[PDB]
Amino acid sequence: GLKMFLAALSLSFIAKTLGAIIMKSSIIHIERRFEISSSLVGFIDGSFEIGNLLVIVFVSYFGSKLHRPKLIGIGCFIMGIGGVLTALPHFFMGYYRTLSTCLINQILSKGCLKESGSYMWIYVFMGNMLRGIGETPIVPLGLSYIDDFAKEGHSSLYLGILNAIAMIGPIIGFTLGSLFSKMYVDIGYVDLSTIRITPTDSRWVGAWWLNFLVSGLFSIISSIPFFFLPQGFFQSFKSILTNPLYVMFVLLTLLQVSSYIGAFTYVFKYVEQQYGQPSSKANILLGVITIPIFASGMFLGGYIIKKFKLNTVGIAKFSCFTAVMSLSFYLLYFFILCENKSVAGLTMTYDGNNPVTSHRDVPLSYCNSDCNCDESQWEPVCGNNGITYISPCLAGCKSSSGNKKPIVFYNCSCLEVTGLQNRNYSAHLGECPRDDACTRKFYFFVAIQVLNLFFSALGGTSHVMLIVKIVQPELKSLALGFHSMVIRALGGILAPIYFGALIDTTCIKWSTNNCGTRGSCRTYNSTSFSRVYLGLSSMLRVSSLVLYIILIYAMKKKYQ
Ligand SMILES: *[C@@H]1O[C@H](CO)[C@@H](O[C@@H]2O[C@H](CO)[C@@H](O)[C@H](O)[C@H]2NC(C)=O)[C@H](O)[C@H]1NC(C)=O
Ligand SMILES: C[C@]12CC[C@H]3c4ccc(OS(=O)(=O)O)cc4CC[C@@H]3[C@@H]1CCC2=O
Ligand SMILES: *[C@@H]1O[C@H](CO)[C@@H](O)[C@H](O)[C@H]1NC(C)=O
């Protein structure tokens, strides 16, 4: 009889997952467009959790479940509104808007402060918090209703089946995300034949608002069927944290999730700054190749735990095994890397021959000297030598071909290598793409990501199964609830934040905002991005592994 409820919940789970990706696939765009640092784009990303942590508290004191289906419905409806709200800042903000050649010819010749636009991110941040306030009722209350209507061995298995179908969402999310990150932000408003920036450039902000509008409409449509369907605490918390093992595990999980959440939030920016790949490719490769294998990994983990008869002391050893395997593959990321992009004036002297300690305050070279011009304009042009430059004026170029589609500057004062004197010094817009070898290494990156995430998923269910055998039977609901709350809150709100702070400390060139304020990051120090990204994710992981080993030792003792 209750097939209706299951269908509806599946729609909702598909909707929930679609929502989460639409947020993490638009990070590279929202950040790029509202012009905020990586830290805030982490804050905005976390606000979703921030809302989740809010709704929890409000129900805990002065709230409770009542008529589950209508509640799930109002939750999904609020999630959809929130998606629509998050898309809304685009319709009342304005158009998302340097080719100046050398001006040796001419030499020695308030509103921005009051920029509400500067706190316009506060809109998206709110919308995401709405989404968080609305999503929370889905999972726990849906599982409660299931367990209310379930025969022997049904509610839990139902979680499994629903989780499987949910994996159809990330597939569409990334697929749609790959489609809308190729469409310029003002698509339909501006004639797309004049926009010079390309999807590979670092100023390209794709249609994120389409992502959010589609996610919101899907969420509302999935909220529709839920209507017309049905017709002390602290004391235990004390105990749950009194059990040393539980504490070890929650800490163990928190460490890994923070390594997962940071990596997910900034994987698109890492793909783009290390290898030359845009966001559209990354999105679709994660959606077509990685997600089916991730679902296969989750299924295989469940089956391995269900068939091989792995007990408590054994399930922990198996999950640790998955981790050693995942970490091994992750630690391989450090051998499939790529040299730094030589951005004259940022990683080297302007003459392109001497490398310097600081990106900041690099003295102008003869070539980039008399040509006085801005020093905060990121209009990158790469020359025949293959070294990126900052701006056509900072490269000392004199003449331009014109607004014709291929814009090739000439007579550039820099690029004064003596080996190409007979050759020209033309430099076309954009940065120059990385050598083929790096594009090749991108595929090793995708393969290592696939294998890592497969071995990660292999231990997915094991986490829930363990969090229930490490704790006394009468504390389970509270123990798993506190686990989920700690993981979501801490990992979700803090990890996108400090990962972005450290990625910020790796940034080389920032862009002026409306009124003289660090805006967004135009180019990064790839190698440092790695040591701060791949590095913080590895230590968090290694530390998780280290505690597991300790946990296994202890479990091997407690039961023996
Ligand atoms: C780029 O430099 C070339 C070579 O100097 C310029 O071509 C010469 O321009 C000047 C003035 O017209 C004269 O030397 C000759 O008429 C041109 N022939 C050459 C090769 O000497 C060219 O005009 C410059 N283009 C700009 C404005 O960037
Ligand atoms: C598998 C996933 C899509 C992308 C995933 C990912 C991708 C790269 C990544 O970092 S990477 O260095 O391993 O590539 C971390 C993660 C963490 C989990 C994250 C999602 C969970 C649900 C989902 O559909
Ligand atoms: C330099 O540019 C000229 C056009 O001005 C082009 O004909 C030439 O092939 C380029 N390089 C060489 C080999 O001189």
Which residue reads 């991108």 in tokens? 442
Q: Are residues 332 and 358 in the same domain?
A: no
The total number of structural domains that make up the chain: 3
Q: Do residues 350 and 375 touch, judged by C-beta distance below 8 A?
A: no
- Which of 383, 402, 433 corresponds to the end of one domain? 433
Q: Are 174 and 48 in contact (CB under 8 A)?
A: no
Method underlying the structure: cryo-EM
Distance (Å, whole) CA 344 – CA 505: 20
Same domain, 308 and 172: no
Whole-number Å distance between alpha carbons of 374 and 378: 10
Q: Distance between CA 406 and CA 391 in Å, rounded? A: 16
Which residues lie across from 512 on neighbouring strands?
518
CA 311 from centre of chain: 35
In 3-state terms, what secondary structure has residue 102?
Answer: coil
Residue 105 lies in a domain: no
378 C-alpha vs ligand 1 centroid, how far in Å? 28
Is 173 contained in some domain?
A: yes
- What amino acid occupies position 47? S
Residue with tokens 């011009």: 373
Tell me how crowded residue 312 is: count the other CB atoms within 10 A of its CB: 15
How many angstroms from the chain centroid is the CA of residue 393? 34
Pocket of ligand 2 from Cβ distances under 6 Å:
170, 260, 263-264, 267, 286, 291, 294, 449, 452-453
CA of 426 to the centre of ligand 3 (A): 9
- Written in H, E and C, the secondary structure of 250-307 is HHHHHHHHHHHHHHHHHHHHHHHHHCCCCHHHHHHHHHHHHHHHHHHHHHHHHHHHHH
Which CATH number characterizes residue 294's domain?
Answer: 1.20.1250.20
Distance CA 454, CA 292 (A): 10
Query: What CA–CA distance (Å, rounded) separates 338 from 448?
Result: 15
Q: 86: which DSSP letter?
A: H
Ligand at minimal distance from the CA of 383 is 3
What is the residue type of 521? C
SS3 464: helix
The two structure tokens encoding residue 324: 């050693």
Amino acid at 117: G
Distance 396 CA to ligand 3 centre (A): 19
Separation of alpha carbons 372 and 294, rounded Å: 54
Residue 495 sits at the vertex; the CA angle it makes with 243 and 139, to the nearest 5 degrees, is: 65
Domain enclosing residue 152, as ranges:
1-97+110-231
Q: Is any atom of ligand 3 closer than 6 Å to the C-beta of 424? A: yes
Residue 356: helix, strand or coil by DSSP? Answer: coil
In terms of domains, do 219 and 240 share one? no
Q: Do 322 and 274 have their domain in common?
A: yes
| Kind plus residue range of the DSSP H or E element containing 507 | strand 507-512
Helices (H), 382-510: 436-457, 460-469, 476-486, 495-505
Same domain as 166, residue 197: yes
Measured distance CA(523)–CA(378) in Å, rounded: 9
* Same domain, yes or no: 140 and 39: yes
Helix axes 138-148, 155-166, angle to 10 degrees: 140
| DSSP three-state, residue 314 | helix
Q: Nearest residue CA, atom 9 of ligand 3?
A: 423
Sequence-distant (≥ 6) Cβ neighbours of residue 91 within 8 angstroms:
209
Q: Whose CA is nearest to atom 14 of ligand 3?
A: 423
| Position 55 in a domain | yes
Residue 104 lies in a domain: no
For residue 441, the tally of other CB atoms under 10 A from its CB is 18
Whole-angstrom Cα distance, residue 527 to residue 524?
Answer: 9
Helices (H), 167-208: 169-180
* Spacing, Cα 536 to ligand 1 middle (Å): 53
The single residue listed with the structure tokens 């998302």 is 96
Count the alpha carbons within 13 Å of 114 in the hemisphere toward its beta carbon.
2
Residues 6+ apart with CB under 8 A from 543: 255
Question: Which atom of ligand 1 is nearest the CA belonging to 399?
Answer: 28
Decide which of 231, 249, 275 is a domain's last residue.
Answer: 231
Residues 306 and 450 both lie in one domain: yes
On whether the CB atoms of residues 185 and 59 are closer than 8 A, the answer is no
**Residues 10 and 122 both lie in one domain:** yes
- As a whole number of angstroms, the distance between CA 358 and CA 355 comes to 9
Q: What is the CA radius of gyration of the chain?
A: 26
In this structure, which amino acid lies at residue 254?
A: L
CA angle 276, 282, 286 (to 5 degrees): 150
Report which protein residue has its CA nearest ligand 1's atom 27.
Answer: 399
> Rounded to whole angstroms, how far apart are CA atoms 77 and 134?
7
Please give the Cα distance from 181 to 271 (Å, whole number). Answer: 15
Q: Tell whether 408 and 445 lie within a shared domain.
A: no
206 phi and psi, to 5 degrees?
Answer: -70, 175
**Helix 291-307 vs helix 460-469: crossing angle, to nearest 10:** 40
> What is the atom index within ligand 3 of the atom nearest the CA of 410?
5
Nearest ligand atom owner, CA of 426? 3
Residues 424 and 555 occupy one common structural domain: no
49 in helix, strand or coil?
helix
Q: How far is CA 444 from CA 84, 161, 186, 326, in A?
A: 38, 32, 35, 15
Compute the distance between CA of residue 73 and CA of residue 145 in angstroms, rounded to an integer.
13
Last residue of a domain, one of 384, 417, 433: 433
CB 286 within 8 A of CB 447: no
Length reported for the chain:
560
Residues 394 and 455 in one domain: no
Considering the domain boundaries, does residue 278 fall inside one?
A: yes
Angle at 407 between CA 276 and CA 442, to 5 degrees: 10
Closest C-alpha among 24, 519, 19, 22 to residue 271: 24
Same domain, 392 and 426: yes
**Candidates 267, 291, 327, 334: which one to mutate for ligand 2, based on the most atoms within 8 Å of Cβ?**
267
Task: Confirm or reject: Cβ of 423 under 6 Å from ligand 3.
Answer: yes
Q: 37 and 520 in contact (C-beta within 8 Å)?
A: yes
Q: How far apart are CA 90 and CA 51, in angstroms?
A: 22
Which mutation among 399, 424, 426 tests ligand 3's pocket best, with the greatest number of atoms within 8 A of CB?
A: 424
How does DSSP classify residue 411?
Answer: -
**The two structure tokens encoding residue 539:** 């230590």
Q: Looking at the CA of 384, which ligand is closest?
A: 3
Which atom of ligand 2 is the closest one to the Cα of 457?
A: 1
Token output for 70 = 């209508």
Q: 427 Cβ partners below 8 Å, 6+ apart?
A: 381, 382, 383, 384, 389, 392, 395, 397, 408, 409, 412, 415
> Which residue from 48, 458, 543 is spatially nearest to 253, judged by alpha carbons?
543
**Residue 147: inside a domain:** yes
- Give me the phi and psi of 46, to 5 degrees please: -80, -20
Where b means 16+ CB within 10 Å and e means fewer, 164-192 reads ebbbbbbbbbbbbbbbbbbebbbeeeeee
- The angle subtended at Cα 132 by Cα 130 and Cα 134, nearest 5°, is 70
103 belongs to a structural domain:
no
The C-alpha torsion from 414 through 420 and 422 to 424, rounded to 10°, is: -50
Write the CA distances from 334 to 274, 315, 528, integer angstroms: 12, 30, 12
- Taking CA atoms, 382 is separated from 104, 340, 429, in Å, by 21, 15, 7
Closest ligand to residue 267's CA: 2
- Backbone torsions φ then ψ of 370, nearest 5 degrees: -60, -35
DSSP 181: T
Q: Which of 18, 28, 264 to mutate to test the pocket of ligand 2 (most atoms within 8 A of CB)?
A: 264
Task: Record the tokens describing residue 210, joined without a space.
Answer: 């389409």
Q: Give the C-alpha separation, 164 to 154, whole Å.
A: 15
Q: Would you say residue 495 lies in a domain?
A: yes
